[PDB]
Swiss-Prot record:
Belongs to the fimbrial CS1 protein family. The keyword Metal-binding does not apply. It comes from the Bacteria. Keywords: Fimbrium, Plasmid, Signal. This is CS1 fimbrial subunit A. GO terms for cellular component: pilus.
């Protein structure tokens, strides 16, 4: 049983899969935004949020061909270095014996203007976004895995 969790704003589990939408006019992907809430067993503590790895989407036929992914949470960019979101900025409301934050935006941003390992090729790209959350001052990690897919039009 985790001390903290990240759920959708309706109380459902975070999606474990996201398919991004391509926009041919700009040769890039739309941002994908998920409305979320933080659950905690201590409303005096904040949360530390990071990625377990730099997320990238690899072309399924040539995984050397890679599209970098950016992830923002609560209006802050995430990286492999943890950031702390103070309890005051989460606006925790009492839900039974535990506490739930106001709605926080989680956004996934594949940037096809910065493809590496070759040029922008049509077809399918895949990668994982792996988000790690801990309560401030605690070490117990909760990991959210999101399998991301994205097709470039051609």
């Amino acid at each position: 049983d985790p001390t903290v969790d990240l759920l959708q704003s309706d109380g459902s589990a975070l999606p474990n899969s996201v398919a991004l939408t391509y926009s041919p006019a700009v040769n890039n992907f739309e941002a994908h935004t998920i409305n979320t809430v933080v659950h905690t067993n201590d409303s005096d503590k904040g949360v530390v949020v990071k990625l377990s790895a730099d997320p990238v989407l690899s072309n399924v036929l040539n995984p050397t061909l890679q599209i970098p992914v950016s992830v923002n949470f609560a209006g802050k960019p995430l990286s492999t270095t943890g950031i702390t979101i103070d309890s005051n900025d989460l606006n925790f409301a009492s839900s039974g014996v535990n506490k739930v934050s106001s709605t926080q935006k989680l956004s996934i941003h594949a940037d096809a203007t910065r493809v590496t390992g070759g040029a922008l090729t049509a077809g399918q790209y895949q990668g994982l976004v792996s988000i790690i959350l801990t309560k401030s001052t605690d070490n117990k990690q909760v990991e959210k895995t999101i399998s991301v897919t994205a097709s470039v039009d051609p």
